[PDB]
Amino acid sequence: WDINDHPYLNIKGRFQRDENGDEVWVVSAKRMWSLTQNEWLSADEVEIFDDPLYAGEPGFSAMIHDHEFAIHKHCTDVVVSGKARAYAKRPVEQMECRLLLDGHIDKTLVIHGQRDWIEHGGSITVSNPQSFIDCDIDYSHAIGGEDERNRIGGGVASSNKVLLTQRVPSVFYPKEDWDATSKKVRVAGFGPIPPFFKQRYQLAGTFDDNWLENRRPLLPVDFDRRYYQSAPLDQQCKGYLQGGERLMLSGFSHDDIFSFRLPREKYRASADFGDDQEFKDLELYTVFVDTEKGVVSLTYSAAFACQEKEHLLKSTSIQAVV
């Protein structure tokens, strides 16, 4: 059952550099389940992503998905790409979207209809929401703007003039809405956290003059491997998912809730660096729910440190654990 060329997993490996500049062989294995077709897609139809994908300019637009070769994650990320879709296609002015993963995640966000700014003697507020059937809910609709928490959002500006060129944010946690005091309103969404969000790039450490002169080429001393997690913090699981957990999403389909139960198969990888055979358990690093396509992607990963014997890598095989 030791399969280099696996019959249902798509498997890909990339070398990465760790925070000391040392090479790491990262093996990622991926499965996709069609919620519509109720079947696993064949490995040929499964793509493991070498690079992040952005909606617009990289670094200035919502991140659709991150790359899949993190050297380490301490828990499973769960991320959603989809739209708010009102029940039965009845127009509404606001609705709730909920991500439920038993034991790990229970998250509701409130989605508002589109709104306009209302100016009044140098004071600005928001109009009533417009009715909608479906809408986008990515971080360009979250609080942000002139704000390192989310520089692609709206509602945070240094002047009324700038504020009026921004989109009124529409995605919030329950009991929160836009207020002029921006830091009291959380950035909200279900999608992956772009590295240019302060909550993430802060974890990469301080690239200051001290670093430039005395630490480089190493990463900064305050680099934190949590930087590799791409889910929102309340969508990071309690450790790694083990199989059998139930996932439920409501508000992303007009007609029904999405429901998915994780497979129980677990995997072990083996990498051959010459005469040295190495074994590491894969863990589930990412659960990516695309409700527009009706697919759930599952990416498993393991990382083999190989600064000693880079060129000596012969083979990598993955076998299911019985």
Numbering used by the authors: 4 to 325
The authors write:
Type VI secretion systems (T6SSs) are dynamic protein nanomachines found in Gram-negative bacteria that deliver toxic effector proteins into target cells in a contact-dependent manner. Prior to secretion, many T6SS effector proteins require chaperones and/or accessory proteins for proper loading onto the structural components of the T6SS apparatus. Next, we present both genetic and biochemical evidence that PIPY domains require a cognate DUF2169 protein to form a functional T6SS spike complex with VgrG. Based on these findings, we propose a model whereby DUF2169 proteins function as molecular chaperones that maintain VgrG–PIPY spike complexes in a secretion-competent state prior to their export by the T6SS apparatus.
To circumvent this obstacle, we next screened a panel of DUF2169 proteins encoded by other Vibrio spp. that are closely related to V. parahaemolyticus and found that the DUF2169 protein from Vibrio xiamenensis, which shares 64% pairwise sequence identity with DUF2169 from V. parahaemolyticus, readily crystallized and we were able to solve its X-ray crystal structure to a resolution of 1.85 Å. The resulting electron density was of excellent quality, and we were able to model the majority of the 337 amino acid protein except for its three N-terminal and 12 C-terminal residues. The overall structure of V. xiamenensis DUF2169 reveals that its secondary structure is almost entirely comprised of β-strands arranged in three antiparallel β-sheets that form the core of the protein. These three β-sheets fold into two β-sandwiches that arise from the two shorter β-sheets stacking against the same face of the third, more elongated β-sheet. A search for structurally similar proteins in the Protein Data Bank using the DALI webserver indicates that the structure of DUF2169 is unique and therefore is considered a novel protein fold. Our structure also reveals that in its crystalline form, DUF2169 adopts a domain-swapped homodimeric arrangement with the swapped region (residues 195–232) consisting of a protruding loop that contains a short α-helix contributed by each protomer. The interface between the protomers is predominantly hydrophobic with several aromatic residues forming π-stacking interactions. In particular, Phe210 and Trp214 from one protomer π-stack with the equivalent residues from the other protomer. Collectively, these biophysical data support the conclusion that the domain-swapped dimer observed in our crystal structure is an artifact of crystal packing and that the protruding loop that facilitates this artifactual dimerization is highly dynamic and extends away from the core of the protein when it exists in its monomeric state in solution.
